[PDB]
């Protein structure tokens, strides 16, 4: 297996096979092992990137997942002051296994490679957490907050999932 973006040293977590091919995956128990600390003498720090809009979140979300639906927010938060360590990891993820986290990660690989000398990075380890909230939740539903799931499809949500589409930078 290949090394880490930065060339640096191997990918730590084991993968899962995923719907993009040049991504790594991580399965529910790999995320719950990050959670439970099982890699802390390893990695520094991880930030959960949920990719979803914020009525998803906010009907369900992996606690202490941060909300970065927007590529201005996911940059802002995550490049403009660096989170400096050991490793730092991101994982990504959406509802399921759509668009939103792949999309996501390949967008901060970008800015990270244009604001770095080639091939150092800020974040060398990302994955997409594979089956997203949507197989997580029934898996370890203690490990979200609240415990609950909203679906981005949610019948009485029509309307906030329009007004969110509004202000991202493409459709
Ligand atoms: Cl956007």
Known sequence: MELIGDYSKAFLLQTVDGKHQDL?????????????????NIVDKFVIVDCRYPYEYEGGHIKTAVNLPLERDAESFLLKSPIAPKRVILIFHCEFSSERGPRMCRFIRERDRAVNDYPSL???????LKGGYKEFFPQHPNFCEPQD????????????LKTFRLKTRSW
Not at 26 to 40: D, H, N, Q, R, Y
Not at 122 to 128: G, L, T
């Open 24 to 40: 790594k995956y991580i399965s529910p128990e790999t995320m719950v092992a990050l959670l439970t600390g099982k890699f802390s």
């Open 149 to 160: 799931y909203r679906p981005m499809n949610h019948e009485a949500f029509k309307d906030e």
């Open 122 to 128: 800020y974040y060398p380890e990302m994955y997409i």
